[PDB]
Amino acid sequence: EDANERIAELVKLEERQRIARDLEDTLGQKLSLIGLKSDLARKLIYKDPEQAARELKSVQQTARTSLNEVRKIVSSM
Amino acid sequence: KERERLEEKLEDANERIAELVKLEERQRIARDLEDTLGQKLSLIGLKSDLARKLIYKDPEQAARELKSVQQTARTSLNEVRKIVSSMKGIRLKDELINIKQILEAADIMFIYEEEKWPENISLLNENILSMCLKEAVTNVVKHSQAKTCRVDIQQLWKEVVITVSDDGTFKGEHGLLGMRERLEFANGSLHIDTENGTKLTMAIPNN
Ligand SMILES: Nc1ncnc2c1ncn2[C@@H]1O[C@H](COP(=O)(O)OP(=O)(O)O)[C@@H](O)[C@H]1O
Numbered sequence: 568e569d570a571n572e573r574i575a576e577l578v579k580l581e582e583r584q585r586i587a588r589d590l591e592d593t594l595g596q597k598l599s600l601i602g603l604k605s606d607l608a609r610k611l612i613y614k615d616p617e618q619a620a621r622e623l624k625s626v627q628q629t630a631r632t633s634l635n636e637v638r639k640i641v642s643s644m
Numbered sequence: 645k646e647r648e649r650l651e652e653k654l655e656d657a658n659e660r661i662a663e664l665v666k667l668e669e670r671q672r673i674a675r676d677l678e679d680t681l682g683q684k685l686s687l688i689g690l691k692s693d694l695a696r697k698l699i700y701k702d703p704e705q706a707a708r709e710l711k712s713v714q715q716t717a718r719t720s721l722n723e724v725r726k727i728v729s730s731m732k733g734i735r736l737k738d739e740l741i742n743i744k745q746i747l748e749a750a751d752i753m754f755i756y757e758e759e760k761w762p763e764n765i766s767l768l769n770e771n772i773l774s775m776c777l778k779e780a781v782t783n784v785v786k787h788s789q790a791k792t793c794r795v796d797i798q799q800l801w802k803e804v805v806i807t808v809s810d811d812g813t814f815k816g817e818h819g820l821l822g823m824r825e826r827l828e829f830a831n832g833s834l835h836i837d838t839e840n841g842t843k844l845t846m847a848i849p850n851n
């Protein structure tokens with residue numbers, strides 16, 4: 568029954584490789600951005616708070632759609 | 645012929661078996677991801693929201709939170725490099741190292757001219773070559789009692805080829821079926837010339 572075993576291992580692997588590329592791209596980028604922007608936002612707490620809040624709503628969105636995306640890369644639908 | 649209709653009913657079922665195994669893996673991985681990354685992303689959204697809440701109320705607590713968010717983004721970045729590397733599986737350059745060890749320590753002289761290292765080899769194909777290679781050298785150390793073993797890794801035009809030759813005693817007639825199968829699966833081939841020691845020619849399309 569190996570015959571099926573080892574071939575199916577090959578397909579998992581491939582599947583694994585695919586997800587891996589997708590993730591790598593989108594996510595590296597999005598996490599760096601979130602770091603950056605959360606830092607600008609900190610820079611404004613005092614000097615311009617309304618701005619800092621908008622920036623934070625932004626960071627919130629990029630984290631949300633980041634989840635979505637991961638979810639999508641691994642979507643079975 | 646009808647050789648066609650048949651090869652294609654075969655293709656159809658292979659494909660279906662295919663999407664089941666595929667999907668099973670994707671789900672398993674989806675759980676892993678929820679569990680790590682999904683949680684970190686969610687957390688970042690949470691803290692950034694909290695911070696926003698504290699802008700006027702407690703500016704210091706908000707700054708503290710944003711520092712927290714920055715850290716969890718950093719560490720998540722890490723999680724990701726690691727994950728993806730790990731999911732990429734074992735890499736051919738690395739398998740080369742592995743077998744240098746194995747040979748040297750089973751006391752066999754290892755021969756390797758470094759060359760035009762191929763350029764557009766899918767990660768999957770890289771993995772099959774690494775596998776076929778580990779096994780071929782295993783068989784060297786187990787069956788040949790050769791004194792020397794040379795591996796060549798060359799770009800030929802359709803395909804990458806890796807040969808492994810040993811000046812030892814071809815016995816037998818599991819590993820070899822395994823190699824022919826993986827290789828076969830990627831639209832490549834195994835060849836076995838015993839004309840003077842065990843010589844193995846593992847060719848696979850680049851893709
Ligand atoms: N480098 C080698 N030198 C001598 N014999 C070999 C070599 N490689 C393979 N063989 C022979 O081919 C047979 C089949 O090998 P394989 O398919 O790897 O199964 P196993 O290693 O379990 O025998 C081996 O039993 C071995 O005797």
Ligand SMILES: [Ca+2]
Nearest residue numbers: 783818819820
């Ligand atoms: Ca073997």
